[PDB]
Design a protein around this ligand. Structure first.
Ligand SMILES: OC[C@H]1O[C@H](O[C@H]2[C@H](O)[C@@H](O)[C@@H](O[C@H]3[C@H](O)[C@@H](O)[C@@H](O[C@H]4[C@H](O)[C@@H](O)[C@@H](O[C@H]5[C@H](O)[C@@H](O)[C@@H](O[C@H]6[C@H](O)[C@@H](O)[C@@H](O)O[C@@H]6CO)O[C@@H]5CO)O[C@@H]4CO)O[C@@H]3CO)O[C@@H]2CO)[C@H](O)[C@@H](O)[C@@H]1O
Ligand SMILES: OC[C@H]1O[C@H](O[C@H]2[C@H](O)[C@@H](O)[C@@H](O[C@H]3[C@H](O)[C@@H](O)[C@@H](O[C@H]4[C@H](O)[C@@H](O)[C@@H](O[C@H]5[C@H](O)[C@@H](O)[C@@H](O[C@H]6[C@H](O)[C@@H](O)[C@@H](O)O[C@@H]6CO)O[C@@H]5CO)O[C@@H]4CO)O[C@@H]3CO)O[C@@H]2CO)[C@H](O)[C@@H](O)[C@@H]1O
Ligand SMILES: OC[C@H]1O[C@H](O[C@H]2[C@H](O)[C@@H](O)[C@@H](O[C@H]3[C@H](O)[C@@H](O)[C@@H](O[C@H]4[C@H](O)[C@@H](O)[C@@H](O)O[C@@H]4CO)O[C@@H]3CO)O[C@@H]2CO)[C@H](O)[C@@H](O)[C@@H]1O
Ligand SMILES: OC[C@H]1O[C@H](O[C@H]2[C@H](O)[C@@H](O)[C@@H](O[C@H]3[C@H](O)[C@@H](O)[C@@H](O[C@H]4[C@H](O)[C@@H](O)[C@@H](O)O[C@@H]4CO)O[C@@H]3CO)O[C@@H]2CO)[C@H](O)[C@@H](O)[C@@H]1O
Ligand SMILES: OC[C@H]1O[C@H](O[C@H]2[C@H](O)[C@@H](O)[C@@H](O)O[C@@H]2CO)[C@H](O)[C@@H](O)[C@@H]1O
Ligand SMILES: [Ca+2]
Ligand SMILES: [Cl-]
Length: 496
C-alpha cells in the first residue's frame, strides 16, 4: 500500500480538483504524460447529494448518496474511458474514496442526487447501495447531539457524526463489503490507489478489514500482485489523542504539518527562516518519509476548511507559492502531491471567506470545460497550477534527481539557501530582503544549464537564465530580492 505504482521515474501526482473525466483523459495524453507526471487524484467519482443551498458547493461531493459512478465529473463510461486512456500513456488515477459516511443527517429526502437515486437521510435509507438504519452508528455514538463534540475523546471521533454526516457502521462485514465492492469496481477499471477521506474518523482496524477485501491492481497495466496505493487523510498537528502513526499499517498518511510549517517559513512568520529548513523532514517532527504524502496546500485548506490556518500558501499568493512548491519538489522528503485549483470569488468578511463554498466553474451547475490558452495556461477560471512553468519544471526536477541524496547545503543564516540532489540537480533560493550574489558548490558536472524556473531548455537553447558550472562544480548565482521568481533550479536534463 506504500508504493504509488507510478511508472518508474515518475514521482508526483496532481489533484485535478473537480475536473471532468473527459478533461482529465485529454490532459493525460496532451500534457501529463509528456511532462512526466505520475498520476491524478480525481474528485470523488461516486454519486453525491445535489445541494442547492448554497448552489452546488465543492463539498457536496463529500456527501455520498450511492456508489454508482455518476457525478458532475461524468458517468461511468467516461470514468472508464479516462482511466484507460490515462493508464495507456502511463499516468495513474487515484480515487478520493469517501467511505466514512453518507450525506448530512439533515438533508431532505428525495432524488436531489447526481444520478437521481432516491435517498432518505432522516430514515437512514440509501436503497441504491443499499444501506438502512442498522448500517450507521446512531446506537454506537455516545454524544448528546450524535455529532462529534470533543476531539480529545478518540472514541467519539470514530463513532459519531463528523459535522452531522451520517456515520457508517464500518464494523459490520456488510458495510465493509459494500465499500469493498465499490473500491474493487474502481480497481478493476484500473485505478492505482486511493485517498481515504476522513480516515481519522475510522478505526484503523475497520480500514484494514476493508482493504483486506480488495483486489490486486489490474494486471494489464501493473505487475501481478500489485496492491493499491493508500494514503489516508489524517489531520494530525499534535496535541490530539489520535496519531497519524496509528494508520501506518494501512498505508501512507497525509502530513498536514508539512504545508503549515513550510508556509510559516516562507511567509517569514513567527521568526521562521529558510536557513532552518536544513533539517527539513523528520527533523521537524514529521512522520517517516516513506509514510508521508506531502503537499503545500490541499482542496480544503486553500479555502480555510479542514486545518492549516493562516500560513497555508495557495495560488492566490503565487510568488511565494511557487517558491514553496519548488522547495517541496526539490527536497527528497515524502511523496509529492501538487494542487490544481479553480478561482472562486474569494470575498473576506472579518477574515472569513463567505464564498469558500463556491463549486467549480459552471453554467447553472454544468461544469465548464478546461480550455487551453495559446500560452499553455487554462481558461474558464481553471488555475492549472500544474501548468505554471515553475511548477511543471520542478515536477520534472524531482523525476530527474530521483534517488539522489540531499547534499551541498548552503545557508546565509537567514533566508538565502541552496542545496543539491546528488550530482543531478541544484536549487537556490533568496527569500531575504536583499540581493543574493554568490559562487556556490553545485555538485553538478561542468557545463551550461538552463534555469528551469525562469525558462526552458528547447533544442540546444535556453529561453531564460543560463547557469555556468565550472570543472570544480562551482557556479555563480544572482537573484535579486525583487525578482519575480526569487529562486533558480538546474538539473542534469536542463544541461546544454
Ligand atoms: O423486500 C421488502 C422488504 O423491504 C425492507 O427491506 C429492504 C431494506 O429496506 C433495504 O435497506 C434493503 O435491505 C438491505 C439492508 O439495507 C442492508 O443493511 C443489508 O442487510 C444485511 C445486514 O446489514 C447484515 O448485518 C445482515 O443482517 C443480519 C442481522 O445483523 C441480524 O440482526 C439478523 O437480523 C434479524 C434481527 O436479529 C431481528 O432483530 C429482526 O429485525 O429480523 C432480522 C432478520 O433476521 O440476521 C441478519 C442476517 O440477514 O444481513 C442483511 C442482509 O444481507 O442487506 C439488505 C438486503 O438488501 O433491501 C431490503 C429488502 O428489500 C423491509 O425492511 C423489509 O421488512 C421488507 O421485507
Ligand atoms: O447536516 C446538518 C449539519 O450542518 C452543518 O454541517 C454541514 C456543513 O456546514 C457543510 O459545510 C458541509 O460540510 C462539508 C465541509 O464543510 C467540508 O469541509 C467537507 O469536509 C470534508 C473534507 O473535504 C474532507 O477532506 C474531510 O475533512 C474533514 C477531516 O477529515 C476531519 O478530520 C475534520 O478536520 C478536523 C480535524 O480532524 C481536527 O484536527 C481539527 O483540525 O478540526 C478539523 C475540523 O475541520 O473535519 C474536516 C472537514 O473538512 O472530511 C469531510 C467529509 O468528507 O465536506 C463536508 C460535507 O459536505 O456539510 C455539513 C453537513 O451537511 C453543521 O456543522 C452540523 O452540525 C449540522 O448537523
Ligand atoms: O450565497 C450567499 C450566502 O449563502 C450561503 O448561506 C445562505 C444559504 O445558502 C441560504 O440558503 C440561506 O440559508 C437559509 C435557508 O435558505 C433557509 O431555508 C433556512 O434553512 C433552514 C432549512 O430550510 C430547514 O429545513 C432546516 O434545515 O433549518 C434551516 C435553518 O436552520 O435558514 C438558512 C439560514 O439559516 O441563507 C444563508 C445565508 O445567506 C453561504 O454558505 C454563505 O456563506 C453565503 O454568504
Ligand atoms: O435536467 C438534468 C439534465 O442532466 C443532463 O443534462 C444534459 C443537458 O440537458 C443537455 O442540454 C446537455 O448539456 C449541454 C449544455 O446544455 C451545454 O450548455 C453545454 O454545457 C457545458 C459544456 O458541457 C461545457 O463544455 C462547458 O464548457 O460549457 C457548457 C456550459 O456553459 O454542453 C452540455 C453537454 O455537454 O447534455 C447534458 C448531459 O450530457 C441529462 O442528460 C438531461 O437528461 C437532464 O436534462
Ligand atoms: O479494530 C476495529 C474496531 O475498533 C474499535 O474497537 C476497539 C475499541 O474502540 C477500543 O477502545 C478497545 O475496545 O479495543 C477495540 C479494538 O481495537 C471499535 O469499537 C469497533 O467497532 C471496530 O470494529
Ligand atoms: Ca466514523
Ligand atoms: Cl488530503
Amino acid at each position: 500500500q506504500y508504493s504509488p505504482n507510478t511508472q518508474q521515474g515518475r514521482t508526483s501526482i496532481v489533484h485535478l480538483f473537480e475536473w471532468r473525466w473527459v478533461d482529465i483523459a485529454l490532459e493525460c495524453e496532451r500534457y501529463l504524460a509528456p511532462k512526466g507526471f505520475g498520476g491524478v487524484q480525481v474528485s470523488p467519482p461516486n454519486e453525491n447529494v445535489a445541494i442547492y443551498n448554497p448552489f452546488r458547493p465543492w463539498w457536496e461531493r463529500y456527501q455520498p448518496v450511492s456508489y454508482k459512478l455518476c457525478t458532475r465529473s461524468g458517468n461511468e463510461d467516461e470514468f472508464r474511458n479516462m482511466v484507460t486512456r490515462c493508464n495507456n500513456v502511463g499516468v495513474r488515477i487515484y480515487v478520493d474514496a469517501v467511505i466514512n459516511h453518507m450525506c448530512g443527517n439533515a438533508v431532505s429526502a428525495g432524488t436531489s442526487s447526481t444520478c437521481g437515486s432516491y435517498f432518505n437521510p432522516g430514515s437512514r435509507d440509501f436503497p441504491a447501495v443499499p444501506y438502512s438504519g442498522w448500517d450507521f452508528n446512531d446506537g454506537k455514538c455516545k454524544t448528546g447531539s450524535g455529532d462529534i463534540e470533543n476531539y480529545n475523546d478518540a472514541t467519539q471521533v470514530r463513532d459519531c457524526r463528523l459535522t452531522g454526516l451520517l456515520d457508517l457502521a464500518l464494523e459490520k462485514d456488510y458495510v465493509r463489503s459494500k465499500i469493498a465492492e465499490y473500491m474493487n469496481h474502481l480497481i478493476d477499471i484500473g485505478v492505482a490507489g486511493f485517498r481515504l477521506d476522513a480516515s481519522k474518523h475510522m478505526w484503523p482496524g475497520d480500514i484494514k478489514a476493508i482493504l483486506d477485501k480488495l483486489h490486486n491492481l489490474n494486471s494489464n497495466w501493473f505487475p501481478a500482485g500489485s496492491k493499491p496505493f493508500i494514503y489516508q487523510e489524517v489531520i494530525d498537528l499534535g496535541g490530539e489523542p489520535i496519531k497519524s502513526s496509528d494508520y501506518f499499517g494501512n498505508g501512507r498518511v497525509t502530513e498536514f504539518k508539512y504545508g503549515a510549517k513550510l508556509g510559516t517559513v516562507i511567509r517569514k512568520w513567527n521568526g521562521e527562516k529558510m536557513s532552518y529548513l536544513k533539517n527539513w523532514g523528520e527533523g521537524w517532527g514529521f512522520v517517516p518519509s516513506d509514510r508521508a504524502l506531502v503537499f503545500v496546500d490541499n482542496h480544503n485548506n486553500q479555502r480555510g476548511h479542514g486545518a492549516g490556518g493562516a500560513s497555508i500558501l495557495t495560488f492566490w499568493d503565487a510568488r511565494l507559492y511557487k517558491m514553496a512548491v519548488g522547495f517541496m519538489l526539490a527536497h527528497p522528503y515524502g511523496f509529492t502531491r501538487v494542487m490544481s485549483s479553480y478561482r472562486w470569488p474569494r470575498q473576506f468578511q472579518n477574515g472569513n471567506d463567505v464564498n469558500d463554498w463556491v463549486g467549480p466553474p459552471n453554467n447553472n451547475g454544468v461544469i465548464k470545460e478546461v480550455t487551453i490558452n495559446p500560452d499553455t495556461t487554462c481558461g474558464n477560471d481553471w488555475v492549472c497550477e500544474h501548468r505554471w512553468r515553475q511548477i511543471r519544471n520542478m515536477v520534472i526536477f524531482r523525476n530527474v534527481v530521483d534517488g539522489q541524496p540531499f547534499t551541498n547545503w548552503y545557508d546565509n543564516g537567514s533566508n538565502q539557501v541552496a542545496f543539491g540532489r546528488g550530482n543531478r540537480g541544484f536549487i537556490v533560493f533568496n527569500n531575504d530582503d536583499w540581493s543574493f550574489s554568490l559562487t556556490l558548490q553545485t555538485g553538478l558536472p561542468a557545463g551550461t544549464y538552463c534555469d528551469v524556473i525562469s525558462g526552458d531548455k528547447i533544442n540546444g537553447n535556453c529561453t531564460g537564465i543560463k547557469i555556468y558550472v565550472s570543472d570544480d562544480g562551482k557556479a555563480h548565482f544572482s537573484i535579486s530580492n525583487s525578482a519575480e521568481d526569487p529562486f533558480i533550479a538546474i538539473h542534469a536534463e536542463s544541461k546544454l
